[PDB]
DNA sequence: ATTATGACGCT
DNA sequence: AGCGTCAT
């Protein structure tokens, strides 16, 4: 008939990663309300990462620092580095590389963002099942693992975890669960080990979710934070989904999700099972329809792509609102600034990863535009030279000036190296 | 004036 | 190729 349980996939998330990096570096920041901020003068600078001690007070991403101090007077703040008049994330990219390299020892890794990796454990699980000469799995192996939906049928939370885990293993040991449930379990054992190795070797804690696909792994990861992991089995999906808002599933958090809500007249992920594949296809098109039909039953095929390195390297800076760029000499200077950071990062890349970028994408925004990008233009990237690239980015945007004066002003500059080639 | 990134889809 | 959506 059908089955969507052949893979074991994990999604790991470095808990408030930027804060961890700063906290490792500055011991005084550890186990305290803490946040990372970039810039300082306009309203204290924007928060981009928040510790759980801080979140408890209601501090969030995309909050001005001055407002964050109101919610949390004892909030400690670390400031992102500033080179060539802009924020620079090199410390965090390098800290991110430390982690990915440890992760690749265990399994195939897909870098999803600077703080998230997807992990395909299917092969590692099979091997591990030989290594265990029929040996049964004890709770001692899963010391930070939650089993979603369990226990079924004590006050402290660790108390609840224990009970859920014991119920699951007792059922596993007596052949009441399924083969895929065994595979997920073994998968979770490997993730504990992977998570223990990350912490020993970097000092960074993190959360993780384990299921049969990427969407479920990412959802599972969020169920129990910080520094805990959660196992979502195929059998838990109907209950989990029955009360799970559509927007919390990955890729339904925007307009597609909003239109699924208002067109079909539903709220929760489970409610999609009522509809036929063709029906969903008729509202949202062929690709989305098919994907929704299977996803709401806990089935997804999107593979874990083997890719530790990013496939584009870019520099970006916004210039709002009166800060907008208005002269030619000024536009050249920021282009030069962005280019110089881009050069340094490209060289480090070539030495590290045996590859060369070949294309330069230049993107722009003008004041009072309906869209986060106004124009996007390409040119050839032949040599790692800031002046060349800056001069060229100027060449492909020169025509957008309507008026030594630049009108209308530029609210955004962006330079991205792409189309990488080995050697 | 919710940054500075980064992935992938549609046409 | 250029633009849009979706993430942190």
- Enumerate domains of chain A plus CATH numbers: 1-15+86-245 (3.30.70.270), 16-85 (3.40.1170.60), 246-303 (1.10.150.20), 304-423 (3.30.1490.100)
Nucleotide nearest to A46 (CA to C1'): B3
> Cβ contacts of residue A193 below 8 Å, gap of 6+?
A106
Beta-bridged to residue A70, according to DSSP, are: none
Which nucleotides of strand C lie within 7 A of protein CB? Answer: 1-8
Please report, rounded to whole angstroms, the spatial distance between the CA atom of protein residue A319 and the C1' atom of nucleotide B3: 11
Q: What share of chain A is helix, strand, coil (3-state, %, to 5)?
A: 45, 20, 35
Alpha carbons A415 and A338: distance in angstroms, whole number:
7
Alpha carbons A365 and A414: distance in angstroms, whole number:
9
Q: Which CA distances in Å does A151 have to A210, A251, A393, A397? A: 18, 30, 59, 61
Q: Which two tokens stand for residue A148?
A: 């979603």
| Dihedral angle of Cα A52, A53, A58, A62, to the nearest 10 degrees | -60
Protein residue closest to C2, using CA and C1'? A376
Chain A window 298-327, residues with Cβ within 7 A of nucleic strand B: 305, 310-318, 320-323
Ramachandran sector of residue A418 (left: φ over 0; alpha: ψ -120 to 50; beta: rest): beta
R_g (Cα) of chain A, nearest Å: 24
Protein residue closest to C6, using CA and C1'? A251
Nucleotide nearest to A376 (CA to C1'): C2
Annotated binding site of A: 13-14, 61, 115-116
Which nucleotides of strand B lie within 7 A of protein CB? Answer: 1-10
Annotated binding site of A for Mn(2+): 13-14, 115-116
Q: Which two tokens stand for residue A127?
A: 């091997």
Q: Which CA distances in Å does A361 have to A156, A379, A385, A389? A: 54, 7, 15, 10
Q: Which two tokens stand for residue A117?
A: 């990796």
- Whether A15 contacts A52, CB under 8 Å: yes
Q: Give alpha helix (H) positions in A51-151.
A: 52-55, 65-71, 90-103, 122-131
Alpha carbons A334 and A414: distance in angstroms, whole number:
10
Please report, rounded to whole angstroms, the spatial distance between the CA atom of protein residue A301 and the C1' atom of nucleotide C8: 23
Which class for A62: exposed (0-12), middle (13-18), buried (19 or more C-beta within 10 A)? Answer: exposed
Residues counted in chain A: 423
Resolution in A: 2.6
Beta-bridged to residue A327, according to DSSP, are: A405
Please report, rounded to whole angstroms, the spatial distance between the CA atom of protein residue A304 and the C1' atom of nucleotide B2: 30
Alpha carbons A84 and A80: distance in angstroms, whole number:
13
Alpha carbons A386 and A363: distance in angstroms, whole number:
17
């Amino acid at each position: 008939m059908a089955t969507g349980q052949d893979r074991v996939v994990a999604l790991v998330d470095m808990d408030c990663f930027f804060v961890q990096v700063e906290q490792r570096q500055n011991p005084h920041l550890r186990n305290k309300p803490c946040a990372v901020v970039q810039y300082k003068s306009w309203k204290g600078g924007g928060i981009i990462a928040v510790s759980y001690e801080a979140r408890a007070f209601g501090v969030t991403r995309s909050m001005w620092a001055d407002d964050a101090k109101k919610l949390c007077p004892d909030l400690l703040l670390a400031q992102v580095r500033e080179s060539r008049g802009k924020a620079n994330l090199t410390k965090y990219r390098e800290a991110s590389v430390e982690v990915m390299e440890i992760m690749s020892r265990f399994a195939v890794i897909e870098r999803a963002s600077i703080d998230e990796a997807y992990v395909d454990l299917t092969s590692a699980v099979q091997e591990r099942l030989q290594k265990l000469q029929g040996q049964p799995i004890s709770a001692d192996l899963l010391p930070s693992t939650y089993i979603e939906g369990l226990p079924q049928g004590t006050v402290q939370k660790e108390g609840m975890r224990k009970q859920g885990l014991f119920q699951w293993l007792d059922s596993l040991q007596i052949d009441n669960l399924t083969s895929p449930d065994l595979q997920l379990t073994v998968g979770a054992v490997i993730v504990e080990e992977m998570r223990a190795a990350i912490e020993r070797e970097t000092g960074f804690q993190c959360s993780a979710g384990i299921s049969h696909n990427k969407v479920l792994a990412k959802l599972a990861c969020g169920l129990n934070k910080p520094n805990r992991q959660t196992l979502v089995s195929h059998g838990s999906v109907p209950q989990l989904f029955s009360q799970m808002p559509i927007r919390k599933i990955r890729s339904l958090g925007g307009k597609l999700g909003a239109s699924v809500i208002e067109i079909l007249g539903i709220e929760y992920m489970g409610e999609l099972t009522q509809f036929t594949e063709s029906q969903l296809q008729s509202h949202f098109g062929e690709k989305n329809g098919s994907w929704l039909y299977a996803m709401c039953r806990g089935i997804e095929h999107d593979p874990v792509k083997p890719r530790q390195l990013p496939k584009t390297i870019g520099c970006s800076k916004n210039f709002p609102g009166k800060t907008a760029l208005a002269t030619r000499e000024q536009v050249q200077w920021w282009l030069l600034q962005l280019a110089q950071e881009l050069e340094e990062r490209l060289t480090k890349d070539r030495n590290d990863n045996d590859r060369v970028a070949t294309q330069l994408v230049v993107s722009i925004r003008v004041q009072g535009d309906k869209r986060l990008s106004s124009l996007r233009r390409c040119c050839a990237l032949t040599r790692y030279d800031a002046h060349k690239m800056s001069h060229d980015a100027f060449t492909v945007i020169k025509n957008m000036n309507t008026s030594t004066e630049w009108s209308p002003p530029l609210t955004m500059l962006f330079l991205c190296a792409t189309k990488f080639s080995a050697s």
